[PDB]
Design an enzyme around this catalytic site. Structure first.
Site, PDB file in Angstrom:
ATOM      1  N   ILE A  95      34.495  -8.379  -5.999  1.00 26.02           N
ATOM      2  CA  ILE A  95      33.231  -8.654  -6.753  1.00 26.02           C
ATOM      3  C   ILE A  95      33.383  -8.452  -8.255  1.00 26.02           C
ATOM      4  CG2 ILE A  95      31.905  -8.079  -4.658  1.00 26.02           C
ATOM      5  CD1 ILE A  95      30.856  -5.582  -5.934  1.00 26.02           C
ATOM      6  N   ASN A 148      27.176  -4.772  -0.165  1.00 28.08           N
ATOM      7  CA  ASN A 148      27.516  -3.421   0.258  1.00 28.08           C
ATOM      8  C   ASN A 148      28.487  -2.734  -0.721  1.00 28.08           C
ATOM      9  OD1 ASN A 148      28.000  -1.089   2.363  1.00 28.08           O
ATOM     10  ND2 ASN A 148      30.027  -2.027   2.196  1.00 28.08           N
ATOM     11  N   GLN A 175      33.797   6.591 -16.654  1.00 35.38           N
ATOM     12  CA  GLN A 175      33.190   6.601 -15.324  1.00 35.38           C
ATOM     13  C   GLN A 175      31.930   5.739 -15.355  1.00 35.38           C
ATOM     14  OE1 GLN A 175      32.525  10.299 -13.287  1.00 35.38           O
ATOM     15  NE2 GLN A 175      34.408  11.328 -14.070  1.00 35.38           N
ATOM     16  N   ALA A 184      26.109   8.739 -13.794  1.00 39.25           N
ATOM     17  CA  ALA A 184      26.516   7.358 -14.026  1.00 39.25           C
ATOM     18  C   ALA A 184      26.278   6.516 -12.778  1.00 39.25           C
ATOM     19  CB  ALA A 184      27.979   7.261 -14.461  1.00 39.25           C
ATOM     20  N   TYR A 185      26.622   7.068 -11.623  1.00 42.97           N
ATOM     21  CA  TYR A 185      26.411   6.396 -10.355  1.00 42.97           C
ATOM     22  C   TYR A 185      24.951   6.062 -10.051  1.00 42.97           C
ATOM     23  CZ  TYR A 185      26.329   5.801  -5.272  1.00 42.97           C
ATOM     24  OH  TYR A 185      26.072   5.415  -4.015  1.00 42.97           O
ATOM     25  N   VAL A 213      26.194   9.402   4.208  1.00 43.60           N
ATOM     26  CA  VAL A 213      27.013   8.924   5.288  1.00 43.60           C
ATOM     27  C   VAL A 213      28.466   9.361   5.113  1.00 43.60           C
ATOM     28  CG1 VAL A 213      27.355   6.913   6.827  1.00 43.60           C
ATOM     29  CG2 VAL A 213      25.325   6.871   5.281  1.00 43.60           C
TER      30      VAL A 213
HETATM   31  N1  LIG Z   1      26.653   8.592   1.269  1.00 45.10           N
HETATM   32  C1  LIG Z   1      27.154   7.386   1.210  1.00 45.10           C
HETATM   33  O1  LIG Z   1      28.337   7.100   1.773  1.00 45.10           O
HETATM   34  C2  LIG Z   1      26.275   6.397   0.482  1.00 45.10           C
HETATM   35  C3  LIG Z   1      24.994   6.793   0.118  1.00 45.10           C
HETATM   36  C4  LIG Z   1      24.201   5.868  -0.545  1.00 45.10           C
HETATM   37  C5  LIG Z   1      24.641   4.583  -0.891  1.00 45.10           C
HETATM   38  N2  LIG Z   1      25.887   4.198  -0.455  1.00 45.10           N
HETATM   39  C6  LIG Z   1      26.420   2.849  -0.753  1.00 45.10           C
HETATM   40  O2  LIG Z   1      27.068   2.323   0.418  1.00 45.10           O
HETATM   41  C7  LIG Z   1      27.876   1.188  -0.047  1.00 45.10           C
HETATM   42  C8  LIG Z   1      29.245   1.266   0.578  1.00 45.10           C
HETATM   43  O3  LIG Z   1      29.865   2.539   0.331  1.00 45.10           O
HETATM   44  P1  LIG Z   1      30.545   3.494   1.458  1.00 45.10           P
HETATM   45  O4  LIG Z   1      29.828   4.759   1.418  1.00 45.10           O
HETATM   46  O5  LIG Z   1      30.796   2.778   2.776  1.00 45.10           O
HETATM   47  O6  LIG Z   1      31.946   3.831   0.711  1.00 45.10           O
HETATM   48  P2  LIG Z   1      33.480   3.423   0.971  1.00 45.10           P
HETATM   49  O7  LIG Z   1      33.995   4.036   2.182  1.00 45.10           O
HETATM   50  O8  LIG Z   1      34.191   3.762  -0.276  1.00 45.10           O
HETATM   51  O9  LIG Z   1      33.533   1.846   1.036  1.00 45.10           O
HETATM   52  C9  LIG Z   1      33.139   1.035  -0.116  1.00 45.10           C
HETATM   53  C10 LIG Z   1      33.547  -0.441   0.152  1.00 45.10           C
HETATM   54  O10 LIG Z   1      33.327  -1.178  -1.064  1.00 45.10           O
HETATM   55  C11 LIG Z   1      34.491  -1.870  -1.431  1.00 45.10           C
HETATM   56  N3  LIG Z   1      34.699  -2.089  -2.897  1.00 45.10           N
HETATM   57  C12 LIG Z   1      34.802  -1.252  -3.948  1.00 45.10           C
HETATM   58  N4  LIG Z   1      34.978  -1.934  -5.081  1.00 45.10           N
HETATM   59  C13 LIG Z   1      35.094  -3.227  -4.716  1.00 45.10           C
HETATM   60  C14 LIG Z   1      35.390  -4.452  -5.404  1.00 45.10           C
HETATM   61  N5  LIG Z   1      35.640  -4.511  -6.766  1.00 45.10           N
HETATM   62  N6  LIG Z   1      35.375  -5.565  -4.636  1.00 45.10           N
HETATM   63  C15 LIG Z   1      35.138  -5.593  -3.338  1.00 45.10           C
HETATM   64  N7  LIG Z   1      34.913  -4.479  -2.675  1.00 45.10           N
HETATM   65  C16 LIG Z   1      34.865  -3.314  -3.349  1.00 45.10           C
HETATM   66  C17 LIG Z   1      35.623  -0.992  -0.890  1.00 45.10           C
HETATM   67  O11 LIG Z   1      36.940  -1.675  -0.669  1.00 45.10           O
HETATM   68  P3  LIG Z   1      38.283  -0.829  -0.853  1.00 45.10           P
HETATM   69  O12 LIG Z   1      38.797  -0.215   0.645  1.00 45.10           O
HETATM   70  O13 LIG Z   1      39.389  -1.790  -1.358  1.00 45.10           O
HETATM   71  O14 LIG Z   1      37.974   0.278  -1.818  1.00 45.10           O
HETATM   72  C18 LIG Z   1      35.013  -0.558   0.460  1.00 45.10           C
HETATM   73  O15 LIG Z   1      35.299  -1.602   1.424  1.00 45.10           O
HETATM   74  C19 LIG Z   1      28.171   1.420  -1.520  1.00 45.10           C
HETATM   75  O16 LIG Z   1      27.318   0.583  -2.266  1.00 45.10           O
HETATM   76  C20 LIG Z   1      27.632   2.844  -1.744  1.00 45.10           C
HETATM   77  O17 LIG Z   1      27.158   2.930  -3.095  1.00 45.10           O
HETATM   78  C21 LIG Z   1      26.705   5.126   0.204  1.00 45.10           C
END
Ligand SMILES: NC(=O)c1ccc[n+]([C@@H]2O[C@H](COP(=O)([O-])OP(=O)(O)OC[C@H]3O[C@@H](n4cnc5c(N)ncnc54)[C@H](OP(=O)(O)O)[C@@H]3O)[C@@H](O)[C@H]2O)c1
Ligand SMILES: [Cl-]
Length: 275
Positions: free
Chosen positions: A62, A88, A104, A191-192, A229
């Site tokens: 992305i 996502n 960051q 920042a996040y 999560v």
């Molecule tokens: N507590 C939580 O876990 C939580 C809470 C609230 C919101 N969220 C949101 O949930 C969504 C997914 O996160 P997650 O928790 O499942 O974390 P995760 O385990 O780090 O997975 C994030 C996914 O996003 C992909 N990604 C990162 N940068 C990218 C790029 N430039 N292009 C394409 N893909 C990219 C990663 O691929 P790679 O394997 O190559 O890195 C990975 O597949 C995110 O938006 C996060 O902000 C998570």
């Protein structure tokens, strides 16, 4: 042809993988797992194949407009567009990472806000009638919002903020952190969380645009909070499994035909939250 398509960014792991899984179960038609790394994407497709599901795969970073545009061309050619999009993909630096704060801010913003935005620029025009778009944000955006100056709160709550205005607030945050003035300029310290204010607010903008431009196409578009999560982004201490975390995004992606909403909402645990 005439076969329906759903697509998840960030699909090779975490909540994204889990969303791909439940869309494979619940969605009538094709489910496209995307991954910026090919080998990660394919490994996870093989994972799902071993559970008896059949996702399709496409590359997607992305952060690359040409990747996003290649993905766009493929969807037009294979399906005539797109029924379901889930945004996502995202990143977060952990707090003890000594990377300078302004770096960051900038890096997180570039993916979380600016990459998400490019995908919506390229993919929204392909969204078919009765389609759903799900932007995964975070409850931390709420916490970041309330820690903003009242003057920044009112901009970000506004029912008439434009995409251009949001773009400039997002850039301002990054620019302020670099000049070492973000606190005084009314910004919060995450920042996040600021990038998810980004995502939450883009969603509201995009939802209004779709009713301005596409009333009657019955398209529903929302932000969500998946919960805390257990993924690479948080930790083993988090409360929900990836599967539990997928729940609200899946719900928003499969909202029944002709449902009137939710649309332009910020959704946590399948309910509409205050912005
Ligand atoms: N507590 C939580 O876990 C939580 C809470 C609230 C919101 N969220 C949101 O949930 C969504 C997914 O996160 P997650 O928790 O499942 O974390 P995760 O385990 O780090 O997975 C994030 C996914 O996003 C992909 N990604 C990162 N940068 C990218 C790029 N430039 N292009 C394409 N893909 C990219 C990663 O691929 P790679 O394997 O190559 O890195 C990975 O597949 C995110 O938006 C996060 O902000 C998570
Ligand atoms: Cl959340």
């Amino acid at each position: 042809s005439g076969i329906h398509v759903a697509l998840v960014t960030g699909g090779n792991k975490g909540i994204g993988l889990a969303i791909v899984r439940d869309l494979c179960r619940l969605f009538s038609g094709d489910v496209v797992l995307t991954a910026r790394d090919v080998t990660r994407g394919q490994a996870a497709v093989q994972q799902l194949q071993a559970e008896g599901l059949s996702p399709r795969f496409h590359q997607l970073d992305i952060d690359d407009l040409q990747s996003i545009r290649a993905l766009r061309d493929f969807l037009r050619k294979e399906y005539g567009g797109l029924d379901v999009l889930v945004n996502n993909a995202g990143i977060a630096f952990k707090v003890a990472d000594p990377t300078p704060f302004h770096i960051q801010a900038e890096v997180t913003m570039k993916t979380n806000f600016f990459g998400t935005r490019d995908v919506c620029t390229e993919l929204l025009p392909l969204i078919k009638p009765q389609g759903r778009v799900v932007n995964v944000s975070s409850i931390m955006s709420v916490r970041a919002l309330k820690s903003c100056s009242p003057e920044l709160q009112q901009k970000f709550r506004s029912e008439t903020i434009t995409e251009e205005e949001l773009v400039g607030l997002m850039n301002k945050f990054v620019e302020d952190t670099k000049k070492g003035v973000h606190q005084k300029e009314g910004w919060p310290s995450s920042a996040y969380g600021v990038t998810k204010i980004g995502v939450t607010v883009l969603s509201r903008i995009h939802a209004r645009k779709l009713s301005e431009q596409r009333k009657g196409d019955k398209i529903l578009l929302n932000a969500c909070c998946p919960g805390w999560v257990r993924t690479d982004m948080a930790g083993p201490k988090a409360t929900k499994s990836p599967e539990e975390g997928a729940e609200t995004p899946v719900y928003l992606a499969l909202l029944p035909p002709d449902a009137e909403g939710p649309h332009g909402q910020f959704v946590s645990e399948k309910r509409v939250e205050q912005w």
